[PDB]
């Protein structure tokens, strides 16, 4: 019973993350342009947050 | 690549640093390995001899250290 509740908890969190996911080319072009216009610093200066999953 | 700056013309001091870098950073070990080739079975025996010599030196100075600690010998 608790495992089933845990599965539902994971599903709820992923829905919030999905708001910023891109699956259409129109969003892809906008994301690429924004990224190029606002460069970030690399690991030579500041430590970067390493991705752990979704 | 080790760079040793010479201060006040003390060339001997710079030479001492160069020797230290070679021993600490393993340059003498690479030269020894590449002088000639030994089979992996013969390289194993060579490593055993070197470690044995190191252990004997460690044992000898372990005895001396105990004498100094107990009898306060000024060597």
């Amino acid at each position: 019973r608790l495992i089933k509740k845990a599965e539902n908890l994971r599903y709820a969190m992923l829905l919030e993350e999905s708001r910023n996911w891109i699956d259409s080319e129109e969003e892809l072009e906008k994301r690429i342009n924004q990224s190029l216009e606002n460069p970030e610093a690399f690991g030579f200066i500041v430590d970067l947050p390493i991705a752990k999953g979704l | 690549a080790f760079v040793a700056e010479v201060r006040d013309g003390n060339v001997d001091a710079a030479l001492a640093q160069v020797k230290k870098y070679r021993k600490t950073e393993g340059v003498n070990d690479s030269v020894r390995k590449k002088e000639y080739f030994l089979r992996p079975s013969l390289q194993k025996f060579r490593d055993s001899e070197l470690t044995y010599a190191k252990n004997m030196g460690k044992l000898i100075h372990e005895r001396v250290n105990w004498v100094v600690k107990r009898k306060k010998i000024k060597l």
Binding site: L2, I3, K5, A6, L9, R10, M13, N20, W21, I22, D23, E25, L28, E29, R31, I32, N33, S35, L36, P39, E40, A41, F42, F44, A51, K52, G53, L54 | -
Partner: protein, 119 residues
């Protein structure tokens, strides 16, 4: 699974960089995946210069992309990087599927029930 791509490209204009990034994105979308993160770090100076048959590159433009797709996407992305001549070097690394383990989720559920039980 979840993959991350790090690409070192020549320090060209924005339009050329955008084109290289768009090729990878469409490959992922076509196969049936989606993209989570797109970032760029600008031009960076490398530890040593990358040498081509008659060229030397002491710096490069670096960008990263994170995406989820079937296991067959790795070969498709590798092919695109090799074909494109504006890309100097690339690497693809797999990442963990989930941020939270099953044990961590169970502890959160148990804590919530204890609060309700106390209430």
């Amino acid at each position: 699974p979840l993959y991350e791509l790090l690409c070192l490209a020549k320090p060209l204009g924005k339009a050329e960089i955008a084109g290289a990034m768009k090729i990878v994105g469409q490959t992922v979308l076509k196969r049936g995946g989606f993209i989570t993160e797109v970032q760029s770090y600008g031009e960076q100076q490398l530890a040593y210069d990358i040498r081509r048959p008659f060229e030397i590159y002491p710096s490069a433009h670096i960008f990263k992309m994170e995406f989820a797709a079937p296991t067959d996407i790795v070969r498709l992305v590798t092919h695109e990087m090799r074909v494109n001549e504006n890309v100097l070097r690339w690497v693809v690394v797999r990442r963990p599927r989930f941020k939270h383990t099953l044990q961590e989720l169970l502890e959160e559920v148990k804590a919530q029930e204890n609060d309700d039980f106390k209430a």
